[PDB]
From a paper:
Voltage-gated sodium (Nav) channels are part of membrane-embedded signaling complexes that initiate the rising phase of action potentials, a crucial event in generating and propagating electrical signals throughout the human body. As key components of these protein assemblies, β-subunits (1) modify Nav channel-gating properties; (2) regulate channel trafficking and localization to distinct surface compartments; and (3) influence channel oligomerization. Structurally, β-subunits are single-transmembrane segment glycoproteins with a short cytoplasmic C-terminal tail and a large V-type immunoglobulin (Ig) extracellular domain that may participate in homophilic and heterophilic interactions, cell adhesion, and cell migration. Of the four known β-subunits and their splice variants (β1–4; gene names Scn1b-Scn4b), β2 and β4 form a disulfide bond with an unidentified Cys within particular Nav channel isoforms.
In addition to 55Cys, the hβ2 crystal structure reveals a unique motif bearing a protruding disulfide-stabilized loop formed by 72Cys and 75Cys. To determine if this loop regulates the gating or pharmacological influence of hβ2 on hNav1.2, we mutated 72Cys and 75Cys to Ala (C72A C75A) but found that it is functionally indistinguishable from WT hβ2. The lack of effect of the C72A C75A mutant on hNav1.2 function suggests that this disulfide bond is not essential for folding, and that its disruption may not significantly affect the position or environment of 55Cys. To verify this hypothesis, we produced recombinant hβ2 extracellular domain containing three Cys mutations: C55A, C72A, and C75A. Size exclusion chromatography demonstrates that the mutant produces monomeric protein, indicating that the bond between 72Cys and 75Cys is unessential for folding. Furthermore, we obtained a crystal structure of the triple mutant at 1.85Å which overlays well onto the C55A structure. The only significant difference is situated in the loop containing both cysteines, which now displays a single conformation. Although the spatial organization of this loop does not seem to impact the ability of hβ2 to modulate hNav1.2 gating or sensitivity to ProTx-II, this region may yet play a functional role in modulating other Nav channel isoforms.
Numbering used by the authors: 27 to 149
Write the structure that this text describes.
């Protein structure tokens, strides 16, 4: 094909105080090689705000411990089965925003992008 298919919910609605799993799966002809696979997760308050990386895969999962998320971010995927989902525990109203997943799976030439708008409902 001409692109890496990435499957995410365009809008994700979560009750304040609950856990938010951000689902992100992708398609590729090639087995994921942990020594070359790349994964980037970023947050932005809005489309015109800067992206803040909070998780990366380089050889292993790297949790950047972004301050706005405390220690509530967990990797919730499995690259060997094409799942790069993240978990956000105990969501607060400030977690509302745009979450981007960027994927590269060498030697696959196409790179992937998923974009989720997380909205926090009143509890």
């Amino acid at each position: 094909s001409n692109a890496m298919e990435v499957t995410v919910p365009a809008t994700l609605n979560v009750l304040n105080g609950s856990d938010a799993r951000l689902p992100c799966t992708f398609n590729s002809a090639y087995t994921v090689n942990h020594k070359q696979f790349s994964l980037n997760w970023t947050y932005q308050e809005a489309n015109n705000a800067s992206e803040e990386m909070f998780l990366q895969f380089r050889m292993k999962i790297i949790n950047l411990k972004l301050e706005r998320f405390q220690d509530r971010v967990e990797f919730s995927g499995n690259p060997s089965k094409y799942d790069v989902s993240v978990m956000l525990r105990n969501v607060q109203p400030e977690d509302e925003g745009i979450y981007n997943c960027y994927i590269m799976n060498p030697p696959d030439r196409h790179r992937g992008h998923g974009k989720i708008h997380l909205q926090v409902l009143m509890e």
